[PDB]
Amino acid sequence: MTKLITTVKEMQHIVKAAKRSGTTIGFIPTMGALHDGHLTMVRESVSTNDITIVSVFVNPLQFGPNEDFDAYPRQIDKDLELVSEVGADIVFHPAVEDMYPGELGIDVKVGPLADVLEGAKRPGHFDGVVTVVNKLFNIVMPDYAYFGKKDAQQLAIVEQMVKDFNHAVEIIGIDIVREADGLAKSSRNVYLTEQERQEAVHLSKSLLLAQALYQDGERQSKVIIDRVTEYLESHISERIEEVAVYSYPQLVEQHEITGRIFISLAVKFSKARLIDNIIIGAE
Amino acid sequence: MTKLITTVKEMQHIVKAAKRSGTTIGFIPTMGALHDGHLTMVRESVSTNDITIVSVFVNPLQFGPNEDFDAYPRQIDKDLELVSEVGADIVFHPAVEDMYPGELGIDVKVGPLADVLEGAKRPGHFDGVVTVVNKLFNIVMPDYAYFGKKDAQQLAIVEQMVKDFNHAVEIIGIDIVREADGLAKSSRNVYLTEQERQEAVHLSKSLLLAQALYQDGERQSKVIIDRVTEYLESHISERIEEVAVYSYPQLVEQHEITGRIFISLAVKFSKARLIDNIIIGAE
Ligand SMILES: CC(C)(CO)[C@@H](O)C(=O)OP(=O)(O)OC[C@H]1O[C@@H](n2cnc3c(N)ncnc32)[C@H](O)[C@@H]1O
Ligand SMILES: CC(C)(CO)[C@@H](O)C(=O)OP(=O)(O)OC[C@H]1O[C@@H](n2cnc3c(N)ncnc32)[C@H](O)[C@@H]1O
């Protein structure tokens, strides 16, 4: 019995009334094709907030010319069903023209945090992310917004935006939800051929390896990177786009580990470009 | 009787509590050194909203190295008194470091609307304006935000930012409040020498001239501009920086008038740089 709100105007009118009353709002922004990674955040919100809102919007601004915008899975009826069973109050599913009624007269761009890793590999991608997340925060006016550590760089950037723009929103980061074999859940996994689906499991395996090496005491980035790379290269035939060690959330490449870092991966299959990571350390 | 709130943290805390209690909020952003122009907006807000918040913050981001940042009038005690007399609830007076704790990680820049008139003469100025207003809107969470048409280009840009970012804020623009002789009120008038003060009255008089020419049927921008310019040059010794006719709020230069426009002026005195304008026309 989850309500489907289709326009920005109706969504905002609902939230303004809720905000001016004492009702706490939980928000989970998504691009649809929901999986248990998304649902885990929804369940969290439903057990903590008065109302939980889930947005389903494939944001064109965060897709590059040669990426998968046209093939991105779109299944609102199912998403709506999956959300209903969790107990979420509303699913916000706006039209593209409603979100972007015309040429933007103001532009938002990410600084240094987007000059490395995914930001360097997908130029402008995060500018598109912060643009739509900023709008969604103003449309839904949540007290708590949930994001997955699956997109670690994204998380750090959204946090920076919340700080820089003074959004009265507390960001909650959830750990990576994985399939039974370890594969990090992602709507894009549907792009995987029955073969790639098997090879793709090695991203997580390689991270388990990285974790064990770190656990035993290894702190030289190059040693971990080489072991992880060597492993992947002997278990997958796809092209490995990235195997890096950066401080987190600062995003400064580390050669020797003495603080909190995240070991991230990027692998390009036929059409599915998957990513995974592990955030570890204290400082 | 007005409370002086000195930190972002406390201001947000108060605002959150206000929202929870169904409090409607009116907001008047200013750079201090208040005059009746500002007070007119405060009065309007006090008569409509449950609480009225007036921010006093000389935003360093909207001042260039060559401008008057160091001389800008600062008199919080005086501002607090004037605001108390009209019934404002709070004066938000933050530290520069509190608003900008460090290097921004996200950057906001105005598009085409800032490529002309004041935007061309003051590059970066409006980026500074939208940056701080965006922040203030998220800190104060107003239902209504008041701005003066004195800064007509600013007003159009703020409205555009409200649209693009989906801010649940209604912008209220007020007409230009003037001194008895016609001079538009401005905190920068304090920079005028006795001589320049009387000369400055001609900016408004030149606009009355422009209006009369328009009333009579003149639609050739060149004719109005030349008439206004020669009038100013024959009455004041200062440099006329700008006399222009652009569509409003579209801000497209008009050589021949067939719709709503605004005739704007910019005059540079020894220290004070004054502006004024009139908005006229149907569409
Ligand atoms: C924020 C968006 C909606 C803005 O367009 C967009 O950039 C976006 O990310 O949408 P989307 O790709 O649909 O993912 C939405 C949220 O789900 C989280 N997520 C995805 N897979 C996960 C997993 N296996 N475990 C835990 N969390 C997971 C992401 O970190 C993100 O915050
Ligand atoms: C919005 C700010 C605070 C962001 O830093 C800054 O750009 C700013 O504008 O500050 P400030 O110059 O102090 O002016 C604050 C508000 O007062 C309005 N105002 C000034 N003189 C007026 C007059 N004579 N009649 C009517 N309205 C008048 C302006 O248009 C502006 O919206």
Side-chain angles (χ1 to χ4, degrees), chain A residues 31 58-74 117-129 188 191 239 241 268 270-275:
Chain A
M31 297 205 290
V58 183
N59 178 41
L61 297 190
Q62 70 192 72
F63 284 77
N66 295 297
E67 305 193 307
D68 63 315
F69 187 75
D70 297 326
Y72 205 91
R74 299 173 164 77
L117 300 169
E118 297 294 279
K121 295 194 180 307
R122 303 181 73 190
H125 169 70
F126 291 120
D127 298 341
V129 171
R188 286 190 166 103
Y191 296 163
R239 177 243 286 174
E241 293 194 5
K268 182 64 169 63
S270 291
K271 295 182 179 177
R273 177 168 181 290
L274 310 181
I275 68 173

Side-chain angles (χ1 to χ4, degrees), chain B:
Chain B
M1 60 79 94
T2 299
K3 295 184 178 65
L4 189 291
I5 300 303
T6 57
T7 69
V8 173
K9 215 294 182 180
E10 171 160 44
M11 188 72 262
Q12 293 213 81
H13 189 298
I14 293 173
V15 170
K16 286 183 173 177
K19 286 291 186 180
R20 284 174 164 290
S21 65
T23 308
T24 53
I25 300 167
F27 174 51
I28 304 78
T30 83
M31 293 205 291
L34 311 177
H35 49 249
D36 203 45
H38 300 123
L39 301 187
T40 294
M41 290 186 288
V42 182
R43 296 196 190 79
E44 175 71 7
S45 180
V46 175
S47 73
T48 75
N49 311 108
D50 291 325
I51 60 170
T52 294
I53 301 179
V54 176
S55 69
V56 170
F57 183 61
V58 183
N59 179 33
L61 287 196
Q62 73 191 70
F63 283 78
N66 62 303
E67 311 186 310
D68 66 319
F69 186 77
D70 292 335
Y72 205 85
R74 296 171 170 78
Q75 51 199 61
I76 191 63
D77 293 63
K78 215 291 189 58
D79 295 342
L80 207 305
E81 183 205 304
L82 296 177
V83 144
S84 300
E85 186 266 67
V86 292
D89 298 274
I90 295 172
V91 166
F92 177 43
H93 189 55
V96 167
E97 192 185 12
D98 196 4
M99 288 294 278
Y100 304 108
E103 190 94 314
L104 293 168
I106 303 299
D107 300 286
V108 183
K109 291 186 177 185
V110 183
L113 293 176
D115 288 344
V116 301
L117 300 168
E118 291 296 280
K121 295 180 58 56
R122 308 181 70 191
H125 174 69
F126 289 118
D127 298 333
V129 170
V130 299
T131 293
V132 77
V133 174
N134 177 53
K135 289 163 64 69
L136 294 171
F137 280 3
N138 289 331
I139 293 173
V140 180
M141 290 171 246
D143 293 287
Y144 300 87
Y146 302 83
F147 290 77
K149 296 183 175 184
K150 163 81 153 48
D151 298 283
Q153 179 167 19
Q154 168 172 87
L155 179 60
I157 289 173
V158 168
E159 292 265 52
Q160 186 62 47
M161 186 268 280
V162 164
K163 171 209 171 201
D164 292 342
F165 289 4
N166 295 106
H167 272 299
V169 177
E170 178 168 303
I171 298 300
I172 299 302
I174 71 155
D175 283 308
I176 298 174
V177 177
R178 305 168 178 286
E179 297 291 352
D181 59 359
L183 175 67
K185 288 183 176 289
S186 175
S187 301
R188 286 185 168 111
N189 288 333
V190 69
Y191 293 162
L192 303 167
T193 62
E194 241 79 303
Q195 168 175 164
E196 305 178 323
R197 175 60 182 73
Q198 293 311 305
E199 285 177 300
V201 189
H202 294 292
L203 274 72
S204 66
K205 300 193 68 173
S206 74
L207 288 172
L208 283 172
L209 170 57
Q211 177 180 55
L213 293 173
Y214 178 90
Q215 304 288 206
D216 294 324
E218 188 56 61
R219 293 296 183 278
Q220 292 303 293
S221 293
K222 295 176 180 180
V223 172
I224 295 175
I225 295 172
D226 290 341
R227 191 80 162 73
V228 167
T229 299
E230 78 159 357
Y231 169 93
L232 288 167
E233 297 194 72
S234 64
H235 292 74
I236 66 177
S237 63
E238 294 75 18
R239 170 175 57 256
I240 313 300
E241 294 193 8
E242 186 107 72
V243 177
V245 181
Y246 276 61
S247 56
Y248 191 89
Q250 296 65 38
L251 308 195
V252 177
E253 179 166 48
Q254 303 298 301
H255 296 89
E256 300 185 81
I257 308 159
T258 57
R260 189 170 181 67
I261 59 173
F262 80 125
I263 304 178
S264 58
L265 309 174
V267 182
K268 180 56 182 293
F269 297 72
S270 55
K271 294 297 180 58
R273 178 172 181 281
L274 311 181
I275 66 174
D276 199 346
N277 76 71
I278 56 174
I279 302 171
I280 63 291
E283 287 302 298

Side-chain angles (χ1 to χ4, degrees), chain A residues 164-206:
Chain A
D164 288 343
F165 288 3
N166 292 287
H167 275 295
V169 181
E170 187 178 314
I171 303 298
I172 301 297
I174 278 63
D175 287 308
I176 299 178
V177 178
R178 304 167 175 289
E179 296 293 349
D181 57 10
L183 182 60
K185 297 205 170 188
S186 174
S187 302
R188 286 190 166 103
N189 286 333
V190 66
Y191 296 163
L192 300 170
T193 67
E194 37 202 357
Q195 179 184 60
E196 303 174 312
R197 177 58 183 71
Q198 242 315 301
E199 295 177 299
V201 180
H202 288 129
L203 270 66
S204 64
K205 317 274 268 194
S206 73

Side-chain angles (χ1 to χ4, degrees), chain A residues 41-81:
Chain A
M41 292 183 279
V42 181
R43 286 196 289 282
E44 178 64 10
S45 179
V46 180
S47 73
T48 301
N49 312 116
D50 293 346
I51 66 174
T52 290
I53 301 175
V54 180
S55 64
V56 176
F57 178 64
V58 183
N59 178 41
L61 297 190
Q62 70 192 72
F63 284 77
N66 295 297
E67 305 193 307
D68 63 315
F69 187 75
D70 297 326
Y72 205 91
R74 299 173 164 77
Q75 53 198 231
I76 189 60
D77 286 66
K78 185 179 179 184
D79 296 336
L80 195 289
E81 296 180 297

